[PDB]
């Protein structure tokens, strides 16, 4: 409907797949080459379904900060026959707050879904499902579970992936450029 939605749609149309684990279907962001991200609570194993195709997992790493605290981002390298458009230049370098973000989701349950969530706070610490978690972004939108893995964007930046909510607020794990140096 406006330039934030334009940027979000460009990312969804070329840099997402539908990922299925034993824990459900998730929006999955492809970042470069065969490297993608998913919330750690998806419990990625040795095999994952990608757009309903059985796919070997070459590597999966559940990130933690240097305090050894959960970040809720799992970086997955997929045995896929096609590379993602490289979008690492859209990743922020530092922790920050943002205005006017969009949360975008694409699953069987929620196809072509886009949500203007407004202001995004650098919230920091969250007790996520009982797990101490760092680098959390917050927005004041009544998100639900089905949008976990959803992509959080501003115009020109891919800033996070949706990981949870409390009924009135949603929470995303930050994406930082430093996670995807090769």
From Swiss-Prot:
<feature type="active site" description="For protease 3C activity">
    <location>
        <position position="41"/>
    </location>
</feature>
<comment type="subunit">
    <text>Interacts with host IFIH1/MDA5; this interaction inhibits host IFIH1.</text>
</comment>
<protein>
    <recommendedName>
        <fullName>Protease 3C</fullName>
    </recommendedName>
</protein>
<comment type="function">
    <text>Major viral protease that mediates proteolytic processing of the polyprotein. Cleaves host EIF5B, contributing to host translation shutoff. Also cleaves host PABPC1, contributing to host translation shutoff. Binds and inhibits host IFIH1/MDA5, thereby inhibiting the type-I IFN production and the establishment of the antiviral state. Cleaves host MAP3K7/TAK1, resulting in inhibition of TRAF6-triggered NF-kappa-B induction. Cleaves host TICAM1; this interaction allows the virus to disrupt host TLR3 signaling. Cleaves host IRF7, resulting in inhibition of type-I IFN production.</text>
</comment>
<feature type="active site" description="For protease 3C activity">
    <location>
        <position position="72"/>
    </location>
</feature>
<feature type="active site" description="For protease 3C activity">
    <location>
        <position position="148"/>
    </location>
</feature>
<feature type="domain" description="Peptidase C3">
    <location>
        <begin position="2"/>
        <end position="180"/>
    </location>
</feature>
């Amino acid at each position: 409907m406006g330039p934030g939605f334009d940027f979000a749609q460009a990312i969804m149309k070329k840099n997402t797949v539908i990922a299925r684990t034993e824990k459900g279907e998730f929006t999955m962001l492809g970042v470069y080459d065969r490297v993608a991200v998913i919330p750690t609570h998806a419990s990625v194993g040795e095999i994952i379904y990608i757009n309903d195709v059985e796919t070997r997992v070459l590597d999966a790493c559940a990130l933690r900060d240097l305090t050894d605290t959960n970040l809720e981002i799992t970086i997955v390298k997929l045995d896929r026959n096609q590379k993602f458009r490289d979008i690492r230049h859209f990743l922020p370098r530092c922790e920050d707050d943002y205005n006017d973000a969009v949360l975008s989701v694409h699953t069987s349950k929620f196809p072509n879904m886009y949500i203007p969530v407004g202001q995004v706070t650098n919230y920091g610490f969250l007790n996520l499902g009982g797990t101490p978690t760092h680098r959390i972004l917050m927005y004041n939108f009544p998100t639900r579970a089905g949008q976990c893995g959803g992509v959080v964007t501003t115009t020109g930046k891919v800033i996070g992936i949706h990981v949870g909510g409390n009924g009135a607020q949603g929470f995303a794990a930050m994406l930082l450029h430093s996670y995807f140096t090769d």
